Amino acid sequence: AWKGEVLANNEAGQVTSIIYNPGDVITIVAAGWASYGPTQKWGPQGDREHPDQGLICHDAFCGALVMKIGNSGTIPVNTGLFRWVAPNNVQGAITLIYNDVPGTYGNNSGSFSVNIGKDQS
Amino acid sequence: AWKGEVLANNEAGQVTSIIYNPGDVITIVAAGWASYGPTQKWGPQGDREHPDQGLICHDAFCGALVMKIGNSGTIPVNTGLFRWVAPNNVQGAITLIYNDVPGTYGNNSGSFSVNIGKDQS
Ligand SMILES: *C(=O)c1ccc(O[C@@H]2O[C@H](CO)[C@H](O)[C@H](O)[C@H]2O)cc1
Ligand SMILES: *C(=O)c1ccc(O[C@@H]2O[C@H](CO)[C@H](O)[C@H](O)[C@H]2O)cc1
Ligand SMILES: [Ca+2]
Ligand SMILES: [Ca+2]
């Protein structure tokens, strides 16, 4: 299992120790407060009121937690995933990323604390 | 394992099928959007800007997810718990509740989708 912080201003994302292999079942729980710029902060589901101005993940709100697995596109994580299995052909190291517009991470603040484990399968 | 919705306007709380027994390790993931009255909505961590005006749980924000185990006091859940063990002497059915001021649940709306499972131990 892995536990760590994902900083909102980390554009490259936080690489975890989890290698997702075909058939793996995983659970993620994410908590905390972060901002993409405004004084307010939002949880891991991001800001449901903010328009998408070119986010790295179009299937989650600005300020949400998302992930990539190996060479995958971004996949929404939000508050987490419960005994979740990846789509076919998705595999590799899990990187966690704050959802923002590329090039605009400099003014971000806060972080999410995240646990990832592999479940029985 | 249990999956269900917890309505924000449900003052008594949502009883789950989970009975927490001594030694149990559990994982909870909570998602979704709800309100304690305003037109806006918040995630399972609630509204970090709203003062505590007499919440059923003083250790979580208004609009956060909390729980009771048997006849325990409220315990914060927020976005969830990862491989969590209860304090000594705490056991019984898990009830999930929206954190609001007693008697003020009538104007609440929305719900959280919640998964609870027992982990290997
Ligand atoms: C309203 O016009 C408005 C409020 C805040 C805001 O913040 C920017 O959002 C961008 C992503 O959409 C990016 O994160 C910038 O760094 C933020 O300052 C934009 C617009
Ligand atoms: C101040 O701007 C303000 C005060 C209260 C409020 O909503 C009420 O919050 C209560 C809990 O603190 C309770 O949930 C009531 O039902 C709400 O109407 C909004 C804004
Ligand atoms: Ca930004
Ligand atoms: Ca209310």
Identify the helix (H) or strand (E) that includes residue A64.
strand A62-69
What was the elucidation method?
X-ray
CATH code that applies to domain B1-121: 2.60.120.430
**Closest Cβ opposite residue A27 in set B27, B30, B120:** B27
Q: For the beta carbon of residue B97, count every other beta carbon within 10 angstroms.
A: 23
Q: Find the Cα–Cα–Cα–Cα dihedral A108, A109, A113, A116, rounded to 10°.
A: 10
Q: In this structure, what DSSP letter does residue A107 have? A: G
Phi, psi (degrees; rounded to nearest 5) at A112:
-110, 140
* Domain ranges across chain B: 1-121
For residue B47 and ligand 2, the question of a CB distance below 6 A is answered with: no
Using a 10 angstrom Cβ sphere, with 0-12 exposed, 13-18 middle and 19 or more buried, the burial of residue A83 is: middle
What is the CB-side half-sphere exposure of residue A30 using CA atoms within 13 A? 29
Decide: A40 in ligand 1 pocket, CB within 6 A. Answer: no
Residue positions counted in chain A: 121
Is the separation of the CB atoms in A90 and A69 below 8 Å?
yes
Question: In which element (H, E) is residue A67 found?
Answer: strand A62-69
Ligand nearest to the CA of A52: 1
Q: Ligand 4 mean position to A58 CA, how many Å?
A: 32
